[PDB]
Amino acid sequence: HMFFLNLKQINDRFNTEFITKFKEILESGWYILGKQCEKFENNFAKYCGVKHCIGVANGLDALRLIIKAYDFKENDEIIVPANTYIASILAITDNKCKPILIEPDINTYNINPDLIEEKITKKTKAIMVVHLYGQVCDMEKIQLLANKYNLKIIEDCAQAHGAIYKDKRVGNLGDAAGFSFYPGKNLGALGDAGCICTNDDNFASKIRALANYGSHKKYENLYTGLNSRLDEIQAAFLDIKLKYLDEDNNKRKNIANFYLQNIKNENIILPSNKFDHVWHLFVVKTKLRDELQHYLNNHDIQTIIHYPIPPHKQKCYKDLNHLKLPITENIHQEVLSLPISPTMKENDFKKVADILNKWKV
Amino acid sequence: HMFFLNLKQINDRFNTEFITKFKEILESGWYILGKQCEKFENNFAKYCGVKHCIGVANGLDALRLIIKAYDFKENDEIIVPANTYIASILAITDNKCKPILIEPDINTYNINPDLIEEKITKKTKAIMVVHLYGQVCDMEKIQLLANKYNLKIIEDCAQAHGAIYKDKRVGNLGDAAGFSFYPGKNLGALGDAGCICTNDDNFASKIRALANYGSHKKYENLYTGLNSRLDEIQAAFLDIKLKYLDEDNNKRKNIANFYLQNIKNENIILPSNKFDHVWHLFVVKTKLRDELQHYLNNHDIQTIIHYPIPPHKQKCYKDLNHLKLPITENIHQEVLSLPISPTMKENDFKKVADILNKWKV
Ligand SMILES: [Cl-]
Ligand SMILES: [Cl-]
Ligand code: NA
Secondary structure: EEOOOHHHHHHHOOOOOOHHHHHHHHOOOOOOOHHHHHHHHHHHHHHHHEEEEEEEEHHHHHHHHHHHHHHOOOOEEEEOOOOOOOOHHHHHHOOOOEEEEOEEEEOOEEEEEHHOHHHHHOOOEEEEEEEEEHHHOOHHHHHHHHHHHOEEOOOOOOOOOOOEOEEOOOOOOOOOEEEEEOOOOOOOOOOOOEEEEEEHHHHHHHHHHHOOOOEEEEEEEOOOOOOOOHHHHHHHHHHHHHOHHHHHHHHHHHHHHHHHOOOOOOOOOOOOOOOOOOOOEEEEEEOOOOHHHHHHHOOOOOOOOOOOOHHOOOOOHHHHOOOOHHHHHHHHHEEEEEEOOOOOOOHHHHHHHHHHHOOOO | OEEEOHHHHHHHHOOHHHHHHHHHHHHOOOOOOOOHHHHHHHHHHHOOOOOOEEOOOHHHHHHHHHHHOOOOOOOOOOEEEEEOHHHHHHHHHHHOEEEEEOEOOOOOOOOOOOHHHHHOOEEEEEEEEEEEHHHOOOHHHHHHHHHHOOOEEEOOOOOOOOOOOOOOEEEOOOOOEEEEOOOOOOOOOOOOOEEEEOOHHHHHHHHHHOOOOOOOOOOEOOOOOEEOOHHHHHHHHHHHOHHHHHHHHHHHHHHHHHHHHHOOOOOOOOOOOOOOEOOOOOOOOOHHHHHHHHHHHHOOEEOOOOOOOHHHHHHHHHHHHOOOHHHHHHHHHHEEEEEEOOOHHHHHHHHHHHHHHHOOO
16 A cells, blocks of 8 residues: 555654754753754754744644734735645634635636736735745745735745745745645645744744743733644654755656656546646546546555535635636536655555556547 | 753753654655554553543643533623633633632632532532642542532643542542643643543544544534644653653652651741642742742752732723632742752752751841
8 A cells, every 4th residue: 555645654764853852852851942943943044044933732723823913804805825734724714804715827826816806805914825835936926916005925835944035035925924834745744733934033932932831931911822733753853854855846847747748538628837836736637537546446446536626615714605716616526635744655656656657539 | 040940951861752753654655643642642541540531732722622622601700710821710711701710729729619609609610620730639528519509610731740639539529520741740741732621522522623623523513612732752752751750759759758858947938738738839928029039040040930920900901800818828928949850959949948048037
């Protein structure tokens, strides 16, 4: 059984260091908001080329906190792609803002920047850009729109750790960015984890407070805060793995290129990489998706759909069910993710391509 | 220096077992919502005598989830002691409910049951009892009241793991209970951690979904949920320690009773318990609190204040600052916590008593 994402394979490279750092943190007696958090933050900040990195409990928290720290009014509007993972939207509604859902470009799977301005209203306060599947969004126009209409840009970076746009990294393309380090992400923890990145000193300091109960100083609560912190253990594990993140992303680039160069099947539309793509998810598109998934499973290849029901169609968002978003809806009916990881064996990726080429419907 | 809480001493007993479990989880390649969580949950349910335990990310999330799951209307009222830790109140306001702050009994530091009924209104939906410092609340009148008015009882168990009221454990004394396993809790993780306990099947399934993005089935989101999970690793650490929790609590009793029997100083009011007490914190009370804390530090003994500013006085709740709660305010001006731990050295507790006896002020 070739697994969709073999984490033990990804992480076995680091066991001996992992155990070392664990023992160290044991030796320290310090498990929360300590020197491993500081060290990881400082390194990830350098990595994204930003001034400030605040470790938090997960990527949904990271998003929810950024939105919270802006103090928007109830029903203020945040423009967001309609085809993202639900978490992006959950962060908006958690904060009693209104998500304004924009169709993607079929050629990027990212928000179509040409479709945003028409949806901008007096209630709009932000654009949440999502670098979906690993590919950075085309920022040029979004940035112009944000300057023009006095909007914040919030990056959801949970799928594109390390992707580059012009001179900058994801995380440094907007006003503030949220990252997930859930274990299957291109930089994955061994438990839940997240961070926020920004260059603004005041904003960063406010975020630190809000993620630690609303307290800047012992005994005192300046804001109504959250408990959303990155555990020492998880910061340590992340820092060890961050050293090899670009390498890992490159190993993904190699497998994706192999897929792109070798899968030749009329029933399958392959993903393109118009801008930098770190290939978190290798997403193909076919009118016979569920059939493909079954076929692959029959050949001992596990595949997972990202994603089959779009946020507007979910039961939790009944009041959005009527929205007509046919590009999003078609994608959701048609996509399927092929196994990819930095450690994935040659024999395994060759088998995926060979079996796809044999699929004859 | 005698530190207020030496987690290295608490935890070093278990170091070999922690390391064993960590490797086992590395072997598993399964870090979230797995077998360690299930095992721990099962054992903590047993420990509390409840049907269901849901591990979640922290004790504040645990409370916030419980209130969320009840789906109360905006400005629905929740009665709550006025002198608890701010997390108890944060859970209420986050959910857009109005906290109705009740004075404690000066002789228990828990909510005075006799002061609740007069504050009940048509908008009241719940009573959140807090077992402060480790002492269980006198539950009988509270349970009768909730039944009389069709209110939910929410237990904030963050500080009282394993305390017993008549025939039941804290966690099994209302409709649903929230627990913190913050590292310095009587049952402390190595990272942030918490849980929710309940006997109600439907509430338990709803909470599991609300803690996992609102998802009860792969690809579907029934609710607008959040991400609040207990890492496999922390579940494993908690399960190791849980087997020693009653032993450890009784060891804390022995030390507290030593303090109670041996400290005699006209300047200090001891925390004589009226109900079972697992002594998470051992809180004394003096008119010269700031002078006391300095004196102890002069004698190389670290103390902390639980707590110096009450919620209604915090800058984050300026809409509550006007409230006249003099018992609460008095407590906050006069309390200080002394070091206690089930592994605390005899010379250390003896020192603390002797040095306090010598204090002439
Ligand atoms: Cl996440
Ligand atoms: Cl076949
Ligand atoms: Na966590």
